[PDB]
A = this chain, B = another copy of it.
């Protein structure tokens, strides 16, 4: 029934504090109410401390807040092997102590930031140690994969080609939200050149609320977590769909809010609104899980979608007749009291697997090579319990992820 969550890496923790905020906010549980149902991991104390100093301070147990005073290191190796190792046990312990206390759970919603040290590496083995300790569950990892041109870390790809290959054979469904492609939404669909990280977080903090929160919440067309991976992954590769939200209108500027279904659903497939720089440049969808929430008439949907199924310029895979999982919830969304999110009475958090990422992965793989081609910051990992193996052998890994996402599509 439940779904634990492990927010790993400063980012996964910032986003965590955010997604965790939106929660109580739409459940009437102020600062000090019940008890969360997740954990927080980081090898840099000062960040988890922000959850220990700032807002939502006492809504957590100093037990579900793991820290390694030591060093973060923007390098996979160190975070996965060398350092990150020391903490893992302890980490697990909570996701085994928190996993027990419950009643027939469904899985762990993992929150990490692909291209980091504590986020890429660590998790790599966290999800790793999970796939074995609970192979019998769902492993949906919600990632924030590398901005297409606006990356931060100098190494980023090293850290992301490595978190992909190690987690690939362990996740159930990996959701993806592109940090940059979300900015566009903040520039083009909300207008603000002042987007603090605290915003992107409010956003995913939204799209995510549509996943677990409301879905695990009764409705006219419930959709379990398992449901996802089933209706969402055509193949064992921990396939990565993309998150998209519909009423991303500004709560100040424009106001046409009352945008009946027929509109908000069409607003999902236009590439300029998908929290991912993977513009459907060719990527044929192969399965979409249209999660609606608020006042929505099933016919409105079983029509708004019909209209789409016949737009053709939206070309769905061949081997897939119908790939539209319509998830209907009741309670409308719940916008921050005064952030910058419109606040409509219905939304569409549609996520999907698109042959599109054939790109995004490509463009991120290429990156890697360029540097590896010169070993660049390699000495930083080797000296951290890794080898020419793990790199070269994780490169070959993704290689067959560029062929995979190619074969499962583009061909009939």
Contact = CB atoms under 8 A, between A and B. Distances in A.
A310 interface: no
A62 B253 contact: yes
Nearest to A259: B101
A109 B282 CA distance: 34
Contacts of A266: 100
A411 interface: no
B35 A256 contact: yes
Contacts of A63: 254
Nearest to A272: B93
Contacts of A256: 35, 61
Number of chain copies forming the complex:
2
A263 interface: yes
A61 B250 CA distance: 12
Interface in A340-357: none
Interface string A340-379: 0000000000000000000000000000000000000000
Contact of A61 (B62, B101, B254): B254
A59 to B, nearest CB: 12
Interface of A: 35, 61-63, 100-101, 191, 253-254, 256, 263, 266
Given A62-B254, A63-B254, 7 more contacts: A35-B256, A61-B254, A61-B256, A62-B191, A62-B253, A100-B266, A101-B263
9 contacts: A35-B256, A61-B254, A61-B256, A62-B191, A62-B253, A62-B254, A63-B254, A100-B266, A101-B263
